[PDB]
Amino acid sequence: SNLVAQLENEVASLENENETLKKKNLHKKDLIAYLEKEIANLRKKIE
């Protein structure tokens, strides 16, 4: 009872940490698309 309570806490703690780390990644993914659009338009210059 007190045990299931802690276990369910743990599940929720881990979900939060992961959900944020997943967001930080999704953002690095937006960043990448950004640098790639940069390179594409830098290259359009010479070529």
Partner: protein, 48 residues
């Protein structure tokens, strides 16, 4: 009603595995970023 413990156990394990992957995903995304940033620095130097 129980095997509730069992479900909680397995789910927690999956979540821990999920974190070790998100961690691997983060460092690789960082390696990809620094390389694109390096590539843009060369390009900017070539064009300039």
């Amino acid at each position: 009603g129980s095997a509730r413990n069992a479900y909680l156990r397995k789910k927690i394990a999956r979540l821990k595995k999920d974190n070790l992957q998100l961690e691997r995903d983060e460092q690789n995304l960082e390696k990809i970023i620094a390389n694109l940033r390096d590539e843009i620095a060369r390009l900017e130097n070539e064009v300039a």
